[PDB]
Amino acid sequence: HYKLVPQIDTRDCGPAVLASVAKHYGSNYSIAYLRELSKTNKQGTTALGIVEAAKKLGFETRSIKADMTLFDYNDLTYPFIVHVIKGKRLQHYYVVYGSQNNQLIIGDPDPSVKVTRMSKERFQSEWTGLAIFLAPQ
């Protein structure tokens, strides 16, 4: 049900989450292509890079600073992208597919994680609050 394009190269988390969301809307783009479109470098992809690439793909985008109450809003549109700090990884992102109970269903491009359930507590600890929403225009 939840489509996720995993990363292989350590710098490709940005291209991966973008490819994942795009795939949900029926479009399939390679990591190599999105890496170039998002100006991804050795350090990874910036939030601006993800947004710029998405816009070039024909998606209406918006970046917001939110908190955990976001998941209590029943009209919330999934899936979307979030910026999470994992250890020294300052440019890691997850795809958020939904929420069930005290857990969220997330898509981590890390090939050893992929799609999994994560407690709201754990997620809240890693999340910067940044959320990127995309929609076909």
Automatic annotation (TrEMBL):
Organism superkingdom: Bacteria
Full-protein residues shown: 49 to 185 of 760
Cellular localization per UniProt: Cell membrane
Segments forming domain Peptidase C39: 7-134
This protein's name: ABC transporter, ATP-binding protein ComA
